[PDB]
Amino acid sequence: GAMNSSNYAELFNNDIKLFVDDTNVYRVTVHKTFEGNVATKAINGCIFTLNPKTGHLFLKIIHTSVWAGQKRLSQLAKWKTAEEVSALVRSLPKEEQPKQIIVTRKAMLDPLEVHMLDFPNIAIRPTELRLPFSAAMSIDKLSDVVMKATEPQMVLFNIYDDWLDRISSYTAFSRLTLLLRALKTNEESAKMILLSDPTITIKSYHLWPSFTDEQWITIESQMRDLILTEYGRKYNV
Amino acid sequence: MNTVPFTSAPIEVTIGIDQYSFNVKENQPFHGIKDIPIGHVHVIHFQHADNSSMRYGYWFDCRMGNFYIQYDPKDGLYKMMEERDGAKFENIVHNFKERQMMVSYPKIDEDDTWYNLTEFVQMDKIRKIVRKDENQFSYVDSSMTTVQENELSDPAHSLNYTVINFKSREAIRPGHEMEDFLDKSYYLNTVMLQGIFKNSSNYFGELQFAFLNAMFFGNYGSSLQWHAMIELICSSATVPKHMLDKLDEILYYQIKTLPEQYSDILLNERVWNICLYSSFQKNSLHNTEKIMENKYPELL
Numbered sequence: 236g237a238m239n240s241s242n243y244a245e246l247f248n249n250d251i252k253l254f255v256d257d258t259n260v261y262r263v264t265v266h267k268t269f270e271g272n273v274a275t276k277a278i279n280g281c282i283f284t285l286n287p288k289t290g291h292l293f294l295k296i297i298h299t300s301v302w303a304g305q306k307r308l309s310q311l312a313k314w315k316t317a318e319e320v321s322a323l324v325r326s327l328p329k330e331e332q333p334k335q336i337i338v339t340r341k342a343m344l345d346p347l348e349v350h351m352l353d354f355p356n357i358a359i360r361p362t363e364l365r366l367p368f369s370a371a372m373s374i375d376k377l378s379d380v381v382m383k384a385t386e387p388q389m390v391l392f393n394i395y396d397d398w399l400d401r402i403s404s405y406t407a408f409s410r411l412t413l414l415l416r417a418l419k420t421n422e423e424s425a426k427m428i429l430l431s432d433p434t435i436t437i438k439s440y441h442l443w444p445s446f447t448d449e450q451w452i453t454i455e456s457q458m459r460d461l462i463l464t465e466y467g468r469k470y471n472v
Numbered sequence: 473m474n475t476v477p478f479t480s481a482p483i484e485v486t487i488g489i490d491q492y493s494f495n496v497k498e499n500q501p502f503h504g505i506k507d508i509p510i511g512h513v514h515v516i517h518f519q520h521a522d523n524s525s526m527r528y529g530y531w532f533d534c535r536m537g538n539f540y541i542q543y544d545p546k547d548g549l550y551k552m553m554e555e556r557d558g559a560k561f562e563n564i565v566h567n568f569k570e571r572q573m574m575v576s577y578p579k580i581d582e583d584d585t586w587y588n589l590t591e592f593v594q595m596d597k598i599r600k601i602v603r604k605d606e607n608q609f610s611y612v613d614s615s616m617t618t619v620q621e622n623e624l625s626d627p628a629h630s631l632n633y634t635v636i637n638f639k640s641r642e643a644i645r646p647g648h649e650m651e652d653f654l655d656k657s658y659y660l661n662t663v664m665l666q667g668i669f670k671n672s673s674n675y676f677g678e679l680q681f682a683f684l685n686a687m688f689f690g691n692y693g694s695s696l697q698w699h700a701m702i703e704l705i706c707s708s709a710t711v712p713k714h715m716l717d718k719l720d721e722i723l724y725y726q727i728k729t730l731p732e733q734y735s736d737i738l739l740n741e742r743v744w745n746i747c748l749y750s751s752f753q754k755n756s757l758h759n760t761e762k763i764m765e766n767k768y769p770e771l772l
């Protein structure tokens with residue numbers, strides 16, 4: 236059924252599963268019109284489809300042309316997400332297809348269930364975890380590929396870089412969610428923390444800097460402090 | 473007019489005949505029901521005084537045979553039987569009438585209620601939902617499950633209503649997922665009306681039969697079917713305008729007839745609020761909306 240902290244280890248067992256986050260699929264700017272009305276302008280978006288065990292990220296770029304002449308875009312966006320995830324599953328060899336798809340927002344359940352009727356043995360589940368996957372567009376290399384797209388495109392990433400050589404999936408997922416929560420809460424400070432020391436760089440084939448085991452402990456502590464600092468600012472604590 | 477004699481009434485029982493009901497005392501000299509209007513199906517139903525468990529009853533049409541009721545003390549219920557000796561049936565009916573041991577079907581002349589609830593219900597369609605081919609009449613009770621209820625358990629004793637499932641490959645054309653899930657017109661018009669039911673009259677017949685089994689027996693799967701068949705129409709953007717007109721009349725008389733004290737168990741708040749206030753047809757059911765708002769405003 237629903238996925239939470241009691242069955243949290245289930246994310247890192249050997250049953251293939253994907254998280255699907257649709258929060259960056261339909262993205263707009265809001266502006267006044269010459270007549271003093273308000274208008275939206277869409278910008279490119281993306282579906283964030285992630286295997287939490289392996290780190291493999293299937294980033295489907297949603298180009299603004301898909302909205303052209305369409306109505307009820309927020310509703311359409313969920314169904315387009317479900318269509319694209321369905322198409323991704325069909326494109327994968329049988330032994331790579333997921334056994335479970337976990338959606339970060341419950342509004343994705345019926346669209347995905349209806350698109351996956353041909354796959355009655357793939358479970359479609361919500362989660363009670365608050366996952367910061369909306370902050371994916373704060374990762375500069377992801378944001379750049381999305382904004383430069385001139386057409387629909389699928390791009391594959393490993394969102395854990397090379398971490399699984401040294402840490403478990405459980406730890407890697409915790410590190411990722413802490414990094415994304417920090418980027419979501421205070422993007423500037425998070426990026427400052429990640430790049431402060433010029434001698435630690437991001438490899439061309441990576442998304443995050445090349446921290447040693449010790450430097451990652453220092454970084455993770457600074458991220459927790461940021462999140463706590465922002466919580467105190469928010470609530471006057 | 474036609475008659476259903478009763479050999480005896482050995483146990484105290486509330487007897488229903490269509491929307492009417494009366495109490496018979498243990499071993500009271502009751503020998504049946506006369507003046508039953510020809511031209512409609514009918515239902516004769518039972519609830520035992522000493523064990524309100526199992527409401528049960530029989531759908532029948534006096535045009536299809538001569539039927540009588542006799543208590544079976546082994547199986548512990550009133551059973552319908554067909555009398556194949558016409559001459560015997562006439563003598564049994566006449567004697568019981570002459571001794572005034574029958575209640576009269578208490579139809580008011582102004583009163584179209586039963587026609588309005590059974591306009592589209594035919595015995596031959598009942599006999600395909602309730603499969604017992606050796607009888608011309610059909611037994612239904614409170615606990616019988618539907619075919620769909622059993623997929624989610626003795627198939628011989630099941631209600632074979634047409635399965636309606638909005639998240640099924642039957643309801644959703646590949647490539648039209650959003651369209652068909654948000655607008656059920658494909659499923660209503662092509663799959664159900666053109667494909668399975670063949671016409672709106674058969675669809676309404678099953679809808680009316682489901683309502684009557686929910687009301688008279690408290691049959692839960694029948695209530696599920698009734699609401700699903702309403703929701704399927706209401707959730708379709710494209711419906712024959714005459715088809716919604718008849719839907720409003722059908723529902724009006726069902727809501728009018730429902731016992732006020734059973735509304736909490738016979739009416740699904742979600743479906744009715746969606747059909748009356750949110751659906752494509754929210755403005756197409758004026759008579760039903762008015763009676764629902766004046767009789768059961770709590771539900772909404």
Ligand SMILES: C1CC1c1nn[nH]n1
Nearest residue numbers: 477479540555561564
């Ligand atoms: C005697 C069998 C009883 C009967 N038959 N037909 N009506 N009453």
